Scaffold this active site. Structure first.
Site, PDB file in Angstrom:
ATOM      1  N   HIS A  75     102.475 167.099  22.500  1.00 43.73           N
ATOM      2  CA  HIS A  75     103.641 168.064  22.464  1.00 43.73           C
ATOM      3  C   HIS A  75     104.499 167.879  21.327  1.00 43.73           C
ATOM      4  O   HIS A  75     105.541 167.197  21.090  1.00 43.73           O
ATOM      5  CB  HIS A  75     104.561 167.366  23.807  1.00 43.73           C
ATOM      6  CG  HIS A  75     104.093 167.865  25.093  1.00 43.73           C
ATOM      7  ND1 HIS A  75     103.473 166.964  26.052  1.00 43.73           N
ATOM      8  CD2 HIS A  75     104.174 169.076  25.774  1.00 43.73           C
ATOM      9  CE1 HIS A  75     103.206 167.439  27.118  1.00 43.73           C
ATOM     10  NE2 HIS A  75     103.491 168.984  26.902  1.00 43.73           N
ATOM     11  N   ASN A  76     103.843 168.671  20.209  1.00 40.66           N
ATOM     12  CA  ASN A  76     104.203 168.715  18.769  1.00 40.66           C
ATOM     13  C   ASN A  76     104.495 170.217  18.554  1.00 40.66           C
ATOM     14  O   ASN A  76     104.301 171.137  19.398  1.00 40.66           O
ATOM     15  CB  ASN A  76     103.049 168.331  17.741  1.00 40.66           C
ATOM     16  CG  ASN A  76     101.710 168.622  18.208  1.00 40.66           C
ATOM     17  OD1 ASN A  76     101.319 169.769  18.396  1.00 40.66           O
ATOM     18  ND2 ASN A  76     100.687 167.832  18.626  1.00 40.66           N
ATOM     19  N   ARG A  78     102.655 172.289  16.573  1.00 42.88           N
ATOM     20  CA  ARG A  78     101.289 172.928  16.839  1.00 42.88           C
ATOM     21  C   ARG A  78     101.269 173.434  18.251  1.00 42.88           C
ATOM     22  O   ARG A  78     100.462 174.647  18.080  1.00 42.88           O
ATOM     23  CB  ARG A  78     100.110 172.126  16.468  1.00 42.88           C
ATOM     24  CG  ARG A  78      98.945 173.002  15.805  1.00 42.88           C
ATOM     25  CD  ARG A  78      97.752 172.079  15.488  1.00 42.88           C
ATOM     26  NE  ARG A  78      98.120 171.578  14.298  1.00 42.88           N
ATOM     27  CZ  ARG A  78      97.799 172.073  12.970  1.00 42.88           C
ATOM     28  NH1 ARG A  78      97.568 173.422  12.786  1.00 42.88           N
ATOM     29  NH2 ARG A  78      98.013 171.552  11.900  1.00 42.88           N
ATOM     30  N   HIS A  79     101.552 172.671  19.100  1.00 40.52           N
ATOM     31  CA  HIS A  79     101.366 173.221  20.505  1.00 40.52           C
ATOM     32  C   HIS A  79     102.422 174.511  20.856  1.00 40.52           C
ATOM     33  O   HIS A  79     102.020 175.414  21.386  1.00 40.52           O
ATOM     34  CB  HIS A  79     101.763 172.165  21.738  1.00 40.52           C
ATOM     35  CG  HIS A  79     102.249 172.414  23.206  1.00 40.52           C
ATOM     36  ND1 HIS A  79     101.218 172.888  23.838  1.00 40.52           N
ATOM     37  CD2 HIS A  79     103.298 172.616  23.558  1.00 40.52           C
ATOM     38  CE1 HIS A  79     101.654 173.176  25.006  1.00 40.52           C
ATOM     39  NE2 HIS A  79     103.042 173.052  24.856  1.00 40.52           N
ATOM     40  N   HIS A 115     110.509 175.889  24.527  1.00 38.89           N
ATOM     41  CA  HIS A 115     109.950 175.443  25.548  1.00 38.89           C
ATOM     42  C   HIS A 115     109.770 173.901  25.499  1.00 38.89           C
ATOM     43  O   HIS A 115     109.869 173.309  26.504  1.00 38.89           O
ATOM     44  CB  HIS A 115     108.792 176.082  26.190  1.00 38.89           C
ATOM     45  CG  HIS A 115     107.453 175.603  25.928  1.00 38.89           C
ATOM     46  ND1 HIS A 115     106.964 175.915  24.456  1.00 38.89           N
ATOM     47  CD2 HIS A 115     106.648 174.862  26.585  1.00 38.89           C
ATOM     48  CE1 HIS A 115     105.847 175.409  24.713  1.00 38.89           C
ATOM     49  NE2 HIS A 115     105.538 174.664  25.949  1.00 38.89           N
ATOM     50  N   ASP A 116     109.297 173.155  24.336  1.00 40.15           N
ATOM     51  CA  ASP A 116     109.234 171.805  24.113  1.00 40.15           C
ATOM     52  C   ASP A 116     109.811 171.197  23.106  1.00 40.15           C
ATOM     53  O   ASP A 116     109.366 169.954  22.652  1.00 40.15           O
ATOM     54  CB  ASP A 116     107.741 171.360  24.044  1.00 40.15           C
ATOM     55  CG  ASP A 116     106.938 171.435  25.441  1.00 40.15           C
ATOM     56  OD1 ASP A 116     107.601 170.836  26.506  1.00 40.15           O
ATOM     57  OD2 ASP A 116     105.708 172.028  25.519  1.00 40.15           O
ATOM     58  N   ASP A 225     101.730 178.329  28.187  1.00 35.82           N
ATOM     59  CA  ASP A 225     101.945 176.829  28.011  1.00 35.82           C
ATOM     60  C   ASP A 225     100.808 175.891  28.357  1.00 35.82           C
ATOM     61  O   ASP A 225     100.782 174.766  27.560  1.00 35.82           O
ATOM     62  CB  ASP A 225     103.127 176.452  29.206  1.00 35.82           C
ATOM     63  CG  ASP A 225     103.698 175.150  29.069  1.00 35.82           C
ATOM     64  OD1 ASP A 225     103.829 174.574  27.885  1.00 35.82           O
ATOM     65  OD2 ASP A 225     104.225 174.519  29.940  1.00 35.82           O
ATOM     66  N   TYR A 247      99.113 160.805  27.031  1.00 38.58           N
ATOM     67  CA  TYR A 247      98.912 160.274  28.302  1.00 38.58           C
ATOM     68  C   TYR A 247      98.793 158.873  28.371  1.00 38.58           C
ATOM     69  O   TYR A 247      99.309 157.945  29.004  1.00 38.58           O
ATOM     70  CB  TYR A 247      97.737 161.037  29.344  1.00 38.58           C
ATOM     71  CG  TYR A 247      98.499 162.392  29.821  1.00 38.58           C
ATOM     72  CD1 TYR A 247      99.513 162.847  29.604  1.00 38.58           C
ATOM     73  CD2 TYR A 247      97.415 162.850  30.605  1.00 38.58           C
ATOM     74  CE1 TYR A 247     100.245 163.857  30.271  1.00 38.58           C
ATOM     75  CE2 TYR A 247      98.073 164.480  31.258  1.00 38.58           C
ATOM     76  CZ  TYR A 247      99.259 164.661  30.941  1.00 38.58           C
ATOM     77  OH  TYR A 247      99.777 165.766  31.585  1.00 38.58           O
ATOM     78  N   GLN A 276      89.572 168.058  33.189  1.00 38.67           N
ATOM     79  CA  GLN A 276      89.516 169.635  32.761  1.00 38.67           C
ATOM     80  C   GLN A 276      88.780 170.493  33.994  1.00 38.67           C
ATOM     81  O   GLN A 276      89.323 171.284  34.457  1.00 38.67           O
ATOM     82  CB  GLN A 276      88.610 169.879  31.631  1.00 38.67           C
ATOM     83  CG  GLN A 276      89.486 169.285  30.344  1.00 38.67           C
ATOM     84  CD  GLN A 276      90.808 170.334  30.245  1.00 38.67           C
ATOM     85  OE1 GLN A 276      91.803 169.474  30.799  1.00 38.67           O
ATOM     86  NE2 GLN A 276      90.954 170.819  29.346  1.00 38.67           N
TER      87      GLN A 276
HETATM   88  O1  LIG Z   1      94.036 171.564  29.477  1.00 42.47           O
HETATM   89  C1  LIG Z   1      94.929 170.830  30.182  1.00 42.47           C
HETATM   90  N1  LIG Z   1      94.294 170.017  30.893  1.00 42.47           N
HETATM   91  C2  LIG Z   1      95.171 169.235  31.842  1.00 42.47           C
HETATM   92  C3  LIG Z   1      94.414 168.315  32.648  1.00 42.47           C
HETATM   93  C4  LIG Z   1      94.179 166.811  31.994  1.00 42.47           C
HETATM   94  C5  LIG Z   1      93.613 166.862  30.609  1.00 42.47           C
HETATM   95  C6  LIG Z   1      93.199 165.570  29.887  1.00 42.47           C
HETATM   96  C7  LIG Z   1      93.762 164.322  30.711  1.00 42.47           C
HETATM   97  C8  LIG Z   1      94.523 164.397  31.734  1.00 42.47           C
HETATM   98  C9  LIG Z   1      94.822 165.700  32.465  1.00 42.47           C
HETATM   99  N2  LIG Z   1      96.365 169.202  31.652  1.00 42.47           N
HETATM  100  C10 LIG Z   1      97.099 170.138  30.765  1.00 42.47           C
HETATM  101  C11 LIG Z   1      96.234 171.025  30.033  1.00 42.47           C
HETATM  102  C12 LIG Z   1      97.221 171.638  29.279  1.00 42.47           C
HETATM  103  N3  LIG Z   1      98.518 171.064  29.575  1.00 42.47           N
HETATM  104  N4  LIG Z   1      98.338 170.095  30.507  1.00 42.47           N
HETATM  105  C13 LIG Z   1      99.586 169.500  30.868  1.00 42.47           C
HETATM  106  C14 LIG Z   1     100.302 170.333  31.900  1.00 42.47           C
HETATM  107  C15 LIG Z   1     101.812 169.607  31.627  1.00 42.47           C
HETATM  108  C16 LIG Z   1     101.886 169.579  30.196  1.00 42.47           C
HETATM  109  C17 LIG Z   1     100.591 168.739  29.934  1.00 42.47           C
HETATM  110 MG   LIG Z   2     106.912 170.998  28.740  1.00 44.45          MG
HETATM  111 ZN   LIG Z   3     104.433 172.920  26.921  1.00 47.22          ZN
END
Ligand SMILES: O=c1[nH]c(Cc2ccccc2)nc2c1cnn2C1CCCC1
Ligand SMILES: [Mg+2]
Ligand SMILES: [Zn+2]
Length: 328
Positions: A75-76, A78-79, A115-116, A225, A247, A276
């Site tokens: 959440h930077n 670049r995102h 948004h972030d 997003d 995470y 994924q």
């Molecule tokens: O491409 C993605 N895969 C996963 C699934 C995932 C990937 C890696 C570790 C844990 C879950 N989650 C995601 C992605 C993009 N944003 N998010 C989340 C939704 C709220 C903000 C972040």
């Molecule tokens: Mg968000």
């Molecule tokens: Zn976002």
């Protein structure tokens, strides 16, 4: 094929062209170059023209927005650039300029960028459980989303950054309402709710209905997003390692603080591939499937790479599972 060497901030005609497609390598650019891209979007979409945005104020605002983003693994800034660039890509692909008003286009773009804002790198689940200042401030109701939203209007409140300075009050109120709705719609806790609401309106979609259009805009910002996997394999992949890093930063803090740890953030449970496969199959694919109902062109451009990625992570999963058994 220019006659002379130009600085990095002066985008090449090739870069300007490439920016309209979701194939754009978001990793090749430094913040100042990414900021120039965002500036071009506002001019190209006719937003500077139609909303009498002062060109220096546009640059000043973008620079401030960038400063207000944190150096988090996922959440930077670049995102925020990806989301905005994907939004820009979808305006061309879906020919949104035909269906939506310039006010809607301004809302979609400004909300995507904002948004972030000032994201701490720890999700709403952490904020609520840890009983943080944000959770106590926002009464456990989308604390982060409300905060990004608050920070967005705090930036725009500053005169040197107010890109809406020449927009009448009635117009400003409309943009503000829209942006708020969209930024709050990004909370994944509401995904199932928003999806069900949109699928309900899908039964007989009406572009002249405000309620229908609001849900479509919500679905569009949601699409951008989480659109990382839609991008080419080489561009999409580094973002998964980014999210895992952020995470794991949280799950370690949660373990240290004695707070519950999410299984998808748990070091001993989560796998890049398994996470994924599930996200693509059950979150990404169904959402883009409903967008394709309105915009058929989305299938070839955005569903095809999602199918390709699902199949790859499934292949990778077989290798990881084999390797982890040897480690046991
Ligand atoms: O491409 C993605 N895969 C996963 C699934 C995932 C990937 C890696 C570790 C844990 C879950 N989650 C995601 C992605 C993009 N944003 N998010 C989340 C939704 C709220 C903000 C972040
Ligand atoms: Mg968000
Ligand atoms: Zn976002």
């Amino acid at each position: 094929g220019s006659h002379m060497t130009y600085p990095k901030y002066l985008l090449s005609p090739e870069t300007i062209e490439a920016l309209r497609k979701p194939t754009f390598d978001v990793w090749l650019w430094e913040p100042n170059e990414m900021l120039s891209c965002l500036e071009h979007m506002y001019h190209d979409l006719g937003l500077v023209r139609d909303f009498s945005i002062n060109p220096v104020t546009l640059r000043r605002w973008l620079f401030c927005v960038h400063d207000n983003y944190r150096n988090n693994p996922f959440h930077n800034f670049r995102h925020c650039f990806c989301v905005a660039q994907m939004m820009y890509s979808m305006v061309w692909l879906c020919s949104l300029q035909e269906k939506f008003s310039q006010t809607d286009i301004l809302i979609l773009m400004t909300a995507a960028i904002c948004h972030d804002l000032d994201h701490p790198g720890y999700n709403n689940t952490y904020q609520i459980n840890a009983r943080t200042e944000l959770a106590v401030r926002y009464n456990d109701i989308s604390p982060l989303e409300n905060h990004h939203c608050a920070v967005a209007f705090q930036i725009l409140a500053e005169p040197e950054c107010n890109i809406f300075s020449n927009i009448p009050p009635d117009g400003f109120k409309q943009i503000r309402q829209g942006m708020i709705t969209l930024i709050l719609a990004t909370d994944m806790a509401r995904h199932a709710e928003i999806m069900d609401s949109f699928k309900e309106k899908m039964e007989n979609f009406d572009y002249s209905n405000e309620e229908h259009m609001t849900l479509l805009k919500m679905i569009l910002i949601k699409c951008c997003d989480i659109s990382n996997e839609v991008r080419p394999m080489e561009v999409a992949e580094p973002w998964v390692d980014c999210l895992l890093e952020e995470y794991f930063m949280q799950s370690d803090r949660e373990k240290s603080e004695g707070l519950p740890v999410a299984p998808f953030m748990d070091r001993d449970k989560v796998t890049k591939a398994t996470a994924q496969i599930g996200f693509i199959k059950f979150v990404l694919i169904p959402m883009f499937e409903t967008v394709t109902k309105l915009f058929p062109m989305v299938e070839e451009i955005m569903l095809q790479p999602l199918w390709e990625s699902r199949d790859r992570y499934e292949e990778l999963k077989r290798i990881d599972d084999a390797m982890k058994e040897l480690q046991k």
